[PDB]
Protein backbone atom coordinates (compact mmCIF):
# COMPACT_ATOMS: atom_id res chain seq x y z
CA UNK A 1 0.00 0.00 0.00
CA UNK A 2 0.91 3.70 0.13
CA UNK A 3 3.76 5.16 2.25
CA UNK A 4 4.16 8.91 2.78
CA UNK A 5 7.62 9.99 1.62
CA UNK A 6 6.84 13.73 1.41
CA UNK A 7 7.06 14.80 5.06
CA UNK A 8 4.56 17.19 6.70
CA UNK A 9 2.49 18.87 5.45
CA UNK A 10 1.77 15.90 3.18
CA UNK A 11 2.14 16.89 -0.47
CA UNK A 12 -0.63 16.94 -3.06
CA UNK A 13 0.47 13.73 -4.80
CA UNK A 14 0.46 11.66 -1.59
CA UNK A 15 -2.64 13.39 -0.22
CA UNK A 16 -4.75 12.83 -3.36
CA UNK A 17 -3.59 9.22 -3.59
CA UNK A 18 -4.69 8.64 0.02
CA UNK A 19 -8.23 9.83 -0.72
CA UNK A 20 -8.43 7.77 -3.90
CA UNK A 21 -7.50 4.55 -2.12
CA UNK A 22 -10.14 5.02 0.56
CA UNK A 23 -12.86 6.05 -1.90
CA UNK A 24 -12.23 2.72 -3.66
CA UNK A 25 -12.12 0.63 -0.45
CA UNK A 26 -15.18 2.24 1.13
CA UNK A 27 -18.61 1.08 -0.19
CA UNK A 28 -19.90 4.68 -0.06
CA UNK A 29 -16.50 6.03 -1.11
CA UNK A 30 -17.30 9.16 -3.09
CA UNK A 31 -19.84 10.56 -0.67
CA UNK A 32 -17.61 9.51 2.25
CA UNK A 33 -14.58 11.37 0.88
CA UNK A 34 -16.78 14.32 -0.09
CA UNK A 35 -18.20 14.62 3.42
CA UNK A 36 -14.73 14.89 5.03
CA UNK A 37 -12.66 16.85 2.49
CA UNK A 38 -13.08 20.61 2.93
CA UNK A 39 -15.72 19.96 5.58
CA UNK A 40 -15.81 23.26 7.44
CA UNK A 41 -16.47 21.94 10.98
CA UNK A 42 -14.21 18.97 11.67
CA UNK A 43 -13.15 18.30 15.24
CA UNK A 44 -9.57 19.18 16.11
CA UNK A 45 -8.11 15.99 17.61
CA UNK A 46 -6.44 16.32 20.98
CA UNK A 47 -2.66 15.96 21.10
CA UNK A 48 -1.81 13.24 23.64
CA UNK A 49 1.10 14.07 25.89
CA UNK A 50 4.20 11.95 25.37
CA UNK A 51 4.58 9.52 28.30
CA UNK A 52 7.70 9.72 30.46
CA UNK A 53 9.12 7.39 33.12
CA UNK A 54 9.45 8.68 36.69
CA UNK A 55 10.57 6.77 39.77
CA UNK A 56 7.02 7.16 41.13
CA UNK A 57 5.75 4.72 38.47
CA UNK A 58 5.80 0.94 38.36
CA UNK A 59 7.26 -0.29 35.14
CA UNK A 60 3.92 -2.02 34.23
CA UNK A 61 2.15 1.34 34.71
CA UNK A 62 4.79 3.00 32.55
CA UNK A 63 4.47 0.40 29.81
CA UNK A 64 0.70 0.77 30.01
CA UNK A 65 1.11 4.54 29.54
CA UNK A 66 3.27 3.89 26.49
CA UNK A 67 0.71 1.47 25.05
CA UNK A 68 -2.14 3.87 25.84
CA UNK A 69 -0.30 6.67 24.01
CA UNK A 70 0.03 4.45 20.94
CA UNK A 71 -3.65 3.47 21.17
CA UNK A 72 -4.52 7.17 21.36
CA UNK A 73 -2.55 7.79 18.17
CA UNK A 74 -4.82 4.98 16.82
CA UNK A 75 -4.08 2.15 14.41
CA UNK A 76 -3.82 3.59 10.89
CA UNK A 77 -6.74 2.23 8.85
CA UNK A 78 -6.37 4.76 5.98
CA UNK A 79 -4.17 2.71 3.65
CA UNK A 80 -1.51 5.45 3.67
CA UNK A 81 1.33 4.94 6.15
CA UNK A 82 2.33 8.38 7.33
CA UNK A 83 5.91 7.75 8.51
CA UNK A 84 8.41 5.93 6.32
CA UNK A 85 10.34 3.26 8.22
CA UNK A 86 13.41 1.81 6.52
CA UNK A 87 13.89 -1.33 8.65
CA UNK A 88 17.67 -1.45 8.17
CA UNK A 89 18.35 2.25 8.80
CA UNK A 90 20.59 2.90 11.83
CA UNK A 91 18.74 3.17 15.15
CA UNK A 92 19.77 6.81 15.53
CA UNK A 93 17.99 7.61 12.28
CA UNK A 94 14.93 5.64 13.39
CA UNK A 95 14.76 7.46 16.73
CA UNK A 96 14.49 10.79 14.88
CA UNK A 97 11.48 9.36 13.04
CA UNK A 98 10.03 8.16 16.35
CA UNK A 99 10.40 11.70 17.72
CA UNK A 100 8.69 13.01 14.57
CA UNK A 101 5.77 10.67 15.28
CA UNK A 102 5.36 12.29 18.70
CA UNK A 103 5.44 15.78 17.19
CA UNK A 104 3.06 15.14 14.26
CA UNK A 105 0.82 12.81 16.31
CA UNK A 106 -0.88 10.75 13.60
CA UNK A 107 -2.17 7.15 13.40
CA UNK A 108 0.44 4.41 12.99
CA UNK A 109 0.80 0.79 11.89
CA UNK A 110 2.71 -2.13 13.40
CA UNK A 111 6.28 -1.27 12.37
CA UNK A 112 6.01 2.42 13.28
CA UNK A 113 4.70 1.28 16.66
CA UNK A 114 7.74 -0.94 17.22
CA UNK A 115 10.09 1.96 16.45
CA UNK A 116 7.99 4.22 18.69
CA UNK A 117 8.10 1.64 21.47
CA UNK A 118 11.88 1.39 21.30
CA UNK A 119 12.09 5.18 21.53
CA UNK A 120 9.77 5.48 24.52
CA UNK A 121 11.65 2.77 26.48
CA UNK A 122 15.28 3.73 25.70
CA UNK A 123 15.83 5.35 29.10
CA UNK A 124 15.15 2.27 31.20
CA UNK A 125 17.86 -0.44 31.63
CA UNK A 126 15.58 -2.96 33.35
CA UNK A 127 13.58 -3.30 30.08
CA UNK A 128 15.07 -5.32 27.25
CA UNK A 129 13.39 -4.84 23.87
CA UNK A 130 13.47 -7.19 20.88
CA UNK A 131 11.31 -7.35 17.74
CA UNK A 132 9.03 -10.34 17.21
CA UNK A 133 7.94 -10.79 13.58
CA UNK A 134 5.23 -13.04 12.16
CA UNK A 135 4.62 -14.19 8.61
CA UNK A 136 1.11 -15.61 8.47
CA UNK A 137 -1.19 -17.13 5.85
CA UNK A 138 -4.87 -16.39 5.36
CA UNK A 139 -7.06 -17.10 2.32
CA UNK A 140 -4.31 -17.44 -0.26
CA UNK A 141 -2.21 -14.51 0.94
CA UNK A 142 0.79 -13.90 3.17
CA UNK A 143 0.80 -11.26 5.90
CA UNK A 144 3.65 -9.62 7.80
CA UNK A 145 3.29 -8.27 11.31
CA UNK A 146 5.70 -7.26 14.04
CA UNK A 147 5.50 -6.36 17.74
CA UNK A 148 8.09 -5.30 20.33
CA UNK A 149 8.86 -8.10 22.75
CA UNK A 150 9.92 -6.92 26.17
CA UNK A 151 11.79 -8.72 28.95
CA UNK A 152 11.73 -7.45 32.53
CA UNK A 153 12.30 -9.11 35.94
CA UNK A 154 12.19 -12.61 34.48
CA UNK A 155 8.92 -12.03 32.59
CA UNK A 156 8.09 -11.55 28.92
CA UNK A 157 5.55 -9.21 27.37
CA UNK A 158 5.01 -7.00 24.37
CA UNK A 159 4.09 -3.58 23.04
CA UNK A 160 2.66 -2.95 19.59
CA UNK A 161 -0.21 -1.95 17.34
CA UNK A 162 -2.54 -4.09 15.24
CA UNK A 163 -6.06 -4.07 13.83
CA UNK A 164 -6.69 -6.81 16.39
CA UNK A 165 -6.59 -6.25 20.14
CA UNK A 166 -5.08 -9.74 20.68
CA UNK A 167 -2.11 -9.14 18.34
CA UNK A 168 -0.21 -6.26 19.97
CA UNK A 169 0.38 -5.59 23.69
CA UNK A 170 0.74 -8.51 26.09
CA UNK A 171 1.20 -8.02 29.84
CA UNK A 172 4.45 -8.88 31.62
CA UNK A 173 3.16 -12.22 32.91
CA UNK A 174 4.74 -14.69 30.48
CA UNK A 175 7.30 -16.85 32.27
CA UNK A 176 8.97 -17.93 29.02
CA UNK A 177 9.52 -16.56 25.55
CA UNK A 178 7.60 -19.62 24.30
CA UNK A 179 4.45 -18.83 26.29
CA UNK A 180 4.43 -15.33 24.77
CA UNK A 181 4.93 -16.59 21.20
CA UNK A 182 2.37 -19.38 21.68
CA UNK A 183 -0.15 -16.83 22.94
CA UNK A 184 0.29 -14.93 19.65
CA UNK A 185 -0.08 -18.19 17.73
CA UNK A 186 -3.28 -19.01 19.61
CA UNK A 187 -4.52 -15.44 19.04
CA UNK A 188 -3.87 -15.72 15.30
CA UNK A 189 -6.00 -18.92 15.25
CA UNK A 190 -9.04 -16.87 16.26
CA UNK A 191 -8.64 -15.03 12.93
CA UNK A 192 -8.01 -18.19 10.85
CA UNK A 193 -4.36 -17.24 10.22
CA UNK A 194 -1.70 -19.94 10.24
CA UNK A 195 1.73 -18.76 11.34
CA UNK A 196 4.31 -19.65 8.69
CA UNK A 197 7.37 -17.94 10.20
CA UNK A 198 8.25 -16.53 13.61
CA UNK A 199 11.29 -14.24 13.55
CA UNK A 200 12.93 -13.07 16.78
CA UNK A 201 15.49 -10.28 16.80
CA UNK A 202 18.25 -9.33 19.22
CA UNK A 203 17.94 -7.01 22.19
CA UNK A 204 17.77 -3.44 20.94
CA UNK A 205 20.58 -1.63 22.76
CA UNK A 206 19.68 1.33 24.92
CA UNK A 207 22.98 2.93 23.81
CA UNK A 208 23.54 1.82 20.20
CA UNK A 209 26.72 2.03 18.17
CA UNK A 210 26.81 4.89 15.70
CA UNK A 211 25.44 3.08 12.63
CA UNK A 212 23.99 0.10 14.50
CA UNK A 213 20.67 -1.18 13.07
CA UNK A 214 17.98 -3.37 14.55
CA UNK A 215 18.54 -7.10 14.12
CA UNK A 216 15.14 -8.41 13.04
CA UNK A 217 15.89 -12.06 12.23
CA UNK A 218 18.32 -13.56 14.71
CA UNK A 219 16.06 -16.62 15.05
CA UNK A 220 13.72 -17.79 12.29
CA UNK A 221 11.38 -20.73 12.89
CA UNK A 222 9.15 -22.32 10.24
CA UNK A 223 6.54 -22.91 12.88
CA UNK A 224 3.84 -24.33 10.58
CA UNK A 225 6.20 -27.27 9.86
CA UNK A 226 7.19 -27.89 13.48
CA UNK A 227 5.57 -29.64 16.41
CA UNK A 228 5.03 -27.39 19.42
CA UNK A 229 7.62 -29.16 21.62
CA UNK A 230 10.26 -28.53 18.97
CA UNK A 231 9.18 -24.89 18.73
CA UNK A 232 9.43 -24.52 22.51
CA UNK A 233 12.82 -26.25 22.53
CA UNK A 234 14.22 -23.84 19.93
CA UNK A 235 12.67 -20.77 21.55
CA UNK A 236 13.87 -21.54 25.08
CA UNK A 237 17.39 -22.32 23.84
CA UNK A 238 17.47 -19.01 21.98
CA UNK A 239 15.92 -16.98 24.81
CA UNK A 240 18.48 -18.50 27.18
CA UNK A 241 21.29 -17.40 24.85
CA UNK A 242 19.75 -13.89 24.73
CA UNK A 243 19.66 -13.64 28.53
CA UNK A 244 23.29 -14.74 28.87
CA UNK A 245 25.53 -14.96 25.84
CA UNK A 246 26.49 -12.08 23.62
CA UNK A 247 25.20 -13.42 20.28
CA UNK A 248 26.60 -12.39 16.93
CA UNK A 249 23.98 -10.71 14.69
CA UNK A 250 22.83 -12.89 11.81
CA UNK A 251 22.16 -10.16 9.23
Amino acid sequence: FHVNKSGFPIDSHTWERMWLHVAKVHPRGGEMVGAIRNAAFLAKPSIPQVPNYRLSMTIPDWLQAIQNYMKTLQYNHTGTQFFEIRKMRPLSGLMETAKEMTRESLPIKCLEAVILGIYLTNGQPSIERFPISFKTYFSGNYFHHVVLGIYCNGYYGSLGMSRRAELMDKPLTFRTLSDLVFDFEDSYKKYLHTVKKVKIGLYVPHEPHSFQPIEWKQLVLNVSKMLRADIRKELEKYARDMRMKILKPAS
Binding site: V22, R37, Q74
Partner: protein
Protein backbone atom coordinates in the same frame (compact mmCIF):
# COMPACT_ATOMS: atom_id res chain seq x y z
CA UNK B 1 2.72 25.59 6.96
CA UNK B 2 1.27 24.77 10.38
CA UNK B 3 -2.33 25.52 9.40
CA UNK B 4 -2.15 23.00 6.55
CA UNK B 5 -0.68 20.38 8.90
CA UNK B 6 -3.52 20.94 11.33
CA UNK B 7 -6.15 20.77 8.60
CA UNK B 8 -4.63 17.55 7.28
CA UNK B 9 -4.49 16.08 10.79
CA UNK B 10 -8.19 16.81 11.39
CA UNK B 11 -9.15 15.12 8.10
CA UNK B 12 -6.84 12.18 8.76
CA UNK B 13 -8.57 11.48 12.08
CA UNK B 14 -12.09 11.83 10.66
CA UNK B 15 -11.05 9.46 7.88
CA UNK B 16 -9.39 7.00 10.27
CA UNK B 17 -12.54 6.87 12.40
CA UNK B 18 -14.64 6.09 9.30
CA UNK B 19 -12.23 3.42 8.07
CA UNK B 20 -12.05 1.89 11.55
CA UNK B 21 -15.84 1.56 11.71
CA UNK B 22 -15.79 0.02 8.24
CA UNK B 23 -13.21 -2.56 9.24
CA UNK B 24 -15.24 -3.46 12.35
CA UNK B 25 -18.42 -3.85 10.28
CA UNK B 26 -16.68 -6.00 7.67
CA UNK B 27 -15.14 -8.16 10.40
CA UNK B 28 -18.58 -8.79 11.91
CA UNK B 29 -20.15 -9.57 8.52
CA UNK B 30 -17.38 -12.10 7.78
CA UNK B 31 -18.05 -13.81 11.13
CA UNK B 32 -21.73 -14.05 10.19
CA UNK B 33 -20.82 -15.85 6.94
Amino acid sequence: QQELKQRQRAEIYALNRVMTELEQQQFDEFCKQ
